[PDB]
Enzyme design. Structure first.
Site, PDB file in Angstrom:
ATOM      1  CE1 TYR A  20      -3.740   2.404  -0.137  1.00 49.46           C
ATOM      2  CE2 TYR A  20      -2.888   3.280   1.935  1.00 49.46           C
ATOM      3  CZ  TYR A  20      -3.747   3.377   0.851  1.00 49.46           C
ATOM      4  OH  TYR A  20      -4.617   4.441   0.750  1.00 49.46           O
ATOM      5  CG  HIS A  67     -11.509   5.349  -6.292  1.00 49.67           C
ATOM      6  ND1 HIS A  67     -10.226   4.846  -6.326  1.00 49.67           N
ATOM      7  CD2 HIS A  67     -11.975   5.109  -5.043  1.00 49.67           C
ATOM      8  CE1 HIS A  67      -9.937   4.308  -5.155  1.00 49.67           C
ATOM      9  NE2 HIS A  67     -10.980   4.456  -4.358  1.00 49.67           N
ATOM     10  CE  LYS A 105      -8.202   9.260 -13.472  1.00 50.38           C
ATOM     11  NZ  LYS A 105      -7.599   8.651 -14.686  1.00 50.38           N
ATOM     12  CD  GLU A 110      -6.757   0.393 -13.030  1.00 45.51           C
ATOM     13  OE1 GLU A 110      -7.656   0.218 -13.888  1.00 45.51           O
ATOM     14  OE2 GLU A 110      -6.990   0.455 -11.797  1.00 45.51           O
ATOM     15  NE  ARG A 142     -11.887   3.372 -20.603  1.00 45.03           N
ATOM     16  CZ  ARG A 142     -11.492   4.290 -19.730  1.00 45.03           C
ATOM     17  NH1 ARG A 142     -11.134   5.493 -20.153  1.00 45.03           N
ATOM     18  NH2 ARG A 142     -11.454   4.004 -18.436  1.00 45.03           N
TER      19      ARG A 142
HETATM   20  C1  LIG Z   1      -5.590   6.235  -8.609  1.00 42.45           C
HETATM   21  O1  LIG Z   1      -5.259   5.789  -7.298  1.00 42.45           O
HETATM   22  C2  LIG Z   1      -6.093   5.994  -6.224  1.00 42.45           C
HETATM   23  C3  LIG Z   1      -7.011   7.049  -6.223  1.00 42.45           C
HETATM   24  C4  LIG Z   1      -7.839   7.244  -5.118  1.00 42.45           C
HETATM   25  C5  LIG Z   1      -7.751   6.391  -4.017  1.00 42.45           C
HETATM   26  C6  LIG Z   1      -6.833   5.334  -4.016  1.00 42.45           C
HETATM   27  O2  LIG Z   1      -6.727   4.478  -2.940  1.00 42.45           O
HETATM   28  C7  LIG Z   1      -7.338   4.727  -1.672  1.00 42.45           C
HETATM   29  C8  LIG Z   1      -6.005   5.144  -5.121  1.00 42.45           C
HETATM   30  C9  LIG Z   1      -5.030   4.015  -5.111  1.00 42.45           C
HETATM   31  C10 LIG Z   1      -4.008   3.990  -4.156  1.00 42.45           C
HETATM   32  C11 LIG Z   1      -3.117   2.922  -4.149  1.00 42.45           C
HETATM   33  C12 LIG Z   1      -2.078   2.845  -3.224  1.00 42.45           C
HETATM   34  N1  LIG Z   1      -1.241   1.793  -3.263  1.00 42.45           N
HETATM   35  C13 LIG Z   1      -1.395   0.810  -4.189  1.00 42.45           C
HETATM   36  N2  LIG Z   1      -0.544  -0.243  -4.228  1.00 42.45           N
HETATM   37  N3  LIG Z   1      -2.396   0.869  -5.094  1.00 42.45           N
HETATM   38  C14 LIG Z   1      -3.259   1.906  -5.094  1.00 42.45           C
HETATM   39  N4  LIG Z   1      -4.254   1.950  -6.009  1.00 42.45           N
HETATM   40  C15 LIG Z   1      -5.140   2.973  -6.032  1.00 42.45           C
HETATM   41  N5  LIG Z   1      -6.117   2.957  -6.973  1.00 42.45           N
END
Ligand SMILES: COc1cccc(OC)c1-c1cc2cnc(N)nc2nc1N
EC number: 6.3.4.14
Length: 445
Positions: A203, A236, A238, A288, A292
């Site tokens: 994380y 989540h 934007k 990820e 598209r």
């Molecule tokens: C675009 O990323 C966002 C955007 C908002 C919240 C959020 O996690 C609480 C994330 C997030 C944070 C992360 C933090 N660490 C992780 N390995 N992956 C993540 N993936 C995410 N999608």
């Protein structure tokens, strides 16, 4: 060129695609629901087909209705836009199988990237830096799972392989929460995606959201078109996007960029695409890939001069990329504000009739919207009704133009987030640049 295409979308992106088609002399077929007969792009299209009633399941997600529309009009290709069937592999597959061109990659490439575990494995193999994680799905053996979490180091995040965005994931900060968190993410993934497969990642506590735009043709060419910072978000979703990302040096740009371009060659990618990264402590970590065109594509266009939608249509027709990598230069700076029909206190969609509309103008001001005076925003679809993009010779000029434009923007009769966008532009931390993905939610708190 493609003679005639079906625009399998609605709203601003459908108008965006329609404009590109007309520039290229491509005939347009606007497919629409019964709620969407008065959309700007529908009224400008060469041909229109009503594909069903208002709810998306019977219109914009209705695969047979969309394919039938392409057949009856004699169209040769289908543009999915973003957000509906645009990342549906079975759809792309069915389109290809029916004899039409799917504007996007091969169906198998869509499902490779739609499966987060195998996407990560492909990228890790190709040399793209990823988050330290499980490097595979987690089983039911909690001794193994605890060992993986120890090896990675708390905190960790559990993610759905069939997931994406904020679905479906939870942070685990100790051994005590791990078993229940894996079980809960599995259950939610099984319910939502009919795919209970989950993985583990370290994380990242305070990262930025930096993504790389790519283009790849059918003749071996694959290019990167710099990056976008998308950290101004809420749950989540934007809110503000900008290009290029503050603090990213030319040498960091080419480092990660070249790695994304190579990955495209390795996997035989076709079309536009985005590599999503978390950026923290000067390090990139792939999470990820979107296969598209994205909502936020206009900021990349402003700073490179490349019409990405036109490129999508060129690629689909078997033309090469009109630009070489050596000819792609970052110039200036662009900021995009999403305009939403939403209530300021609840953040819930706020549909209704626009009674007065005025769009901003001037040097470096680009207004991407289908809305007009007397238009009714329907309750059946997403709340985003427009995009304001401003470009300047530098970041400060782009932000300065944004503030001016936002003040010229009139949208009466409905509630909007225009006042919030103004607040963000006037935010001293935003004005400094480099704020993380958690900033907006804590400012709002
Ligand atoms: C675009 O990323 C966002 C955007 C908002 C919240 C959020 O996690 C609480 C994330 C997030 C944070 C992360 C933090 N660490 C992780 N390995 N992956 C993540 N993936 C995410 N999608």
């Amino acid at each position: 060129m493609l003679d005639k295409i079906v625009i399998a979308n609605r709203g601003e992106i459908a108008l965006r695609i329609l404009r590109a088609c007309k520039e290229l002399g491509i005939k347009t077929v606007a497919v629409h629901s019964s709620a969407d007969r008065d959309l700007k792009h529908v009224l400008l299209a060469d041909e229109t087909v009503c594909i069903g009633p208002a709810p998306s399941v019977k219109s914009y997600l209705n695969i047979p209705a969309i394919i039938s529309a392409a057949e009856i009009t004699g169209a040769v290709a289908i543009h999915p836009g973003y957000g509906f069937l645009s990342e549906n592999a079975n759809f792309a597959e069915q389109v290809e199988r029916s004899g039409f061109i799917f504007i996007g990659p091969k169906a198998e490439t869509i499902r490779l990237m739609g499966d987060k575990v195998s996407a990560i494995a492909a990228m890790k193999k190709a040399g793209v830096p990823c988050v330290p994680g499980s490097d595979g799905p987690l089983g039911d053996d909690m001794d193994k799972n605890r060992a993986i979490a120890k090896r990675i180091g708390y905190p960790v995040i559990i993610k759905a392989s069939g997931g994406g965005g904020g679905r479906g994931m939870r942070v685990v900060r100790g051994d005590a929460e791990l078993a229940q968190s894996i079980s809960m993410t599995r259950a939610e993934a099984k319910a939502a995606f009919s795919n209970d497969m989950v993985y583990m990642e370290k994380y990242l506590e305070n990262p930025r959201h930096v993504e790389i735009q790519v283009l790849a043709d059918g003749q071996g060419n694959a290019i990167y078109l710099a990056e976008r910072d998308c950290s101004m978000q809420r749950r989540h979703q934007k809110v503000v996007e900008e290009a290029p990302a503050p603090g990213i040096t030319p040498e960091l740009r080419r480092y990660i960029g070249e790695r994304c371009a190579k990955a495209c060659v390795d996997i035989g990618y076709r079309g536009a695409g985005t590599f999503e990264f978390l950026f923290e402590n000067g390090e990139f970590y792939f999470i990820e890939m979107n296969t598209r065109i994205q909502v936020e594509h206009p900021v990349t266009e402003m700073i490179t001069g490349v019409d990405l939608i036109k490129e999508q249509l060129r690629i689909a027709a078997g033309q090469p990329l009109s630009i070489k990598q050596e000819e792609v230069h970052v110039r200036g700076h662009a900021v995009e504000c999403r305009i939403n029909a939403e209530d300021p206190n609840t953040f819930l969609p706020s549909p209704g009739k626009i009674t007065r509309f005025h769009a901003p103008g001037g040097f470096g001001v680009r207004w991407e919207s289908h809305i007009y005076a007397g238009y009714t925003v329907p309750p059946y679809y997403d709340s985003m009704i427009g995009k304001l993009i401003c470009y300047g010779e530098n970041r400060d000029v782009a932000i300065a133009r944004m503030k001016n434009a936002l003040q010229e923007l009139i949208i009466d009769g409905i509630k909007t987030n225009v006042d919030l966008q103004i607040r963000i532009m006037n935010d001293e931390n935003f004005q400094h640049g480099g704020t993380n993905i958690h900033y907006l939610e804590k400012k709002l708190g």
